[PDB]
DNA sequence: AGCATAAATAATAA
DNA sequence: TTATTATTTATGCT
């Protein structure tokens, strides 16, 4: 169901700009309550429609829902938008790779509670540790073996 | 008269956005150009409301006499909207350069060394490096404005 | 199954 | 005004 979608992508960018919003902001609000599928790059790609049809179809409903909720918060006070968004999580910093004792301590705590992580669990762990994903997944791989 | 120009502020930006237009196009096209010129910075400041209300009120008019003038007389055959702007505009985005790792170290080597170089020594680096100056100017620009995070 | 960054644009300085 | 710096997008990556 195609040109349906393209129109949504269209309206979305519009409505977004109308609530005076950056992809980055949405990115943050979204990834919080939804998931990593909702990063700023993702928003850009969606809006530009640089995704596969299977992917758009999936995203659309979840964008629409959220876009509405946001528009509601905007209604009561253009500072309730802010409540709903973030409104300024900001420290986009590079993912560490070199280990620190605090890091290895953390990794081990995770291990006692989860020796055989699924790959999703590995991305989740790495994100919150702010470590390279490969660094984390290999640590776990060896630790078992 | 404040909201009269504070709301034309807010709305002007979004009308310009919702026409896929850069500030730097607005001023660039709407520039007289035999006086008064209109720079991007103007447009920016205007939008963000960084001007004296006294000069705000001055600009506000000539804005509408272009914004409205181009919203209709541009949108009705967009091959013509893009001629409301003119200046042989429509060009395709620059392709995202991918640097050879050989050259990748070359940079941050000379970067760990000299953080904010000069246009003279920059084009020197670029020359011997087989990469075009602007691209190279920006690697530093970027790497400089990125390491604040980490 | 999104990070890292290169380019573009917008803000701010001169 | 111009020149620069900072934010924001877009895109290479299997």
UniProtKB/Swiss-Prot annotation, chain A:
The gene is POU6F1. Transcription factor that binds preferentially to a variant of the octamer motif (5'-ATGATAAT-3'). This is POU domain, class 6, transcription factor 1. Residues 92-145 bind DNA. The lineage of its organism: Eukaryota, Metazoa, Chordata, Craniata, Vertebrata. In the embryo, expressed exclusively in the developing brain, whereas in the adult its expression is restricted to brain, heart, skeletal muscle and lung. In the brain, the highest expression levels are found in specific cell layers of the cortex, the olfactory bulb, the hippocampus and the cerebellum. The chain holds residues 453 to 597 of 611 of the full protein. It is found in: Nucleus. Residues 1-71 form the POU-specific domain. Belongs to the POU transcription factor family. Class-6 subfamily.
């Amino acid at each position: 169901n195609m040109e349906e979608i393209r129109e949504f992508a269209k309206n979305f960018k519009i409505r977004r700009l109308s609530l005076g919003l950056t992809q980055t902001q949405v990115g943050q609000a979204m990834t919080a309550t939804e998931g990593p599928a909702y990063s700023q790059s993702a928003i850009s790609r969606f809006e530009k429609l640089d995704i596969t049809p299977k992917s758009a179809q999936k995203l659309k409903p979840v964008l629409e829902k959220w876009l509405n909720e946001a528009e509601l918060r905007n209604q009561e006070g253009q500072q309730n938008l802010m409540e709903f968004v973030g409104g300024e999580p900001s420290k986009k910093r590079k993912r560490r790779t070199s280990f620190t004792p605090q890091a290895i301590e953390a990794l081990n705590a995770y291990f006692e509670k989860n020796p055989l992580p699924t790959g999703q669990e590995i991305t989740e762990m790495a994100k919150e540790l702010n470590y390279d994903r490969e660094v984390v997944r290999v640590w776990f791989s060896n630790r078992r073996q």
